[PDB]
Design a protein around this nucleic acid. Sequence first.
RNA 1: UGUAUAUA
Length: 341
Amino acid sequence: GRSRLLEDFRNNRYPNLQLREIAGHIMEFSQDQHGSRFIQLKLERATPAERQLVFNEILQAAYQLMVDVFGNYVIQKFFEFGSLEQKLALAERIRGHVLSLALQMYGCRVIQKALEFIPSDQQNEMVRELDGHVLKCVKDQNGNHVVQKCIECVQPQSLQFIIDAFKGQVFALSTHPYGCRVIQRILEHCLPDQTLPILEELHQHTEQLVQDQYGNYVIQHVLEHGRPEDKSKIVAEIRGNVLVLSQHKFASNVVEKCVTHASRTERAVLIDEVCTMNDGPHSALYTMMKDQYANYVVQKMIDVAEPGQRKIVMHKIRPHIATLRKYTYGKHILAKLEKYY
RNA sequence: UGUAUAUA
Ligand SMILES: [Cl-]
């Protein structure tokens, strides 16, 4: 099965083996773990002629290397360190196979690398091959990384068909484990005509989303990178629910990003909400202090409060200082206190 | 004291 040169290579009998010595043997070495490593090592620092000898033998059977557990790294190197003509010729071997490669455990790493290094002409052809399988790729554990890469690498206008597919389905995909990744990328790289409709669906489902295992991340993303108009829509959704959302394992993270990224006014209003409104005998603030998640909100509020409003939080906390000690999460508030005493 | 992405 393995050629003598390969076995003898494996068997450690050529510590001085050079690329030129494995002529006629690239495909075999490429599909072998040590051989493949050998080839990669030698490539990052090989003369264009050496790199060309190696290419000549992988071009025809390229696809086979792209879907190989060991060969995919060799292809990838040519996409990184190869030549403009070499990258274009592999781009051709890929044509008509973008879909099946992007759903492939190993192939999809090659599609990702190709998208980073080819011209927009070839990018746009690759993308177009996904026309009609947007949700299939987004839900696939291989495919979704290709869709994220497209979004990061290709002109936003070539991605309009991905948008068309997310339309009406944004809530579904934001609570999905891969889809929430793609939604975020669209928010970062897509055009106003594109992020607009998506932002609308997001605002429509903020209540559910902030509480969702994956959805909260999309809401936090908007808070950290979005337009003030969008940040405020979200903040308004937290208003009046600060206490409850803070005690939630997922929503409490979004509450923090609210306190942190909200306008001066909106921040003061949120902090005041739990200073003022009561939760039974003592205020919302006190209940939050004792809670496994809420105590993190308290501390972050202490962090970003204007010096004047920090005074008010401190005064509300102060009467309980001695009793906080007796609570698992209150203790941690005492910690943040020292910083400011 | 608290939540998310993949190959040797
Ligand atoms: Cl031989």
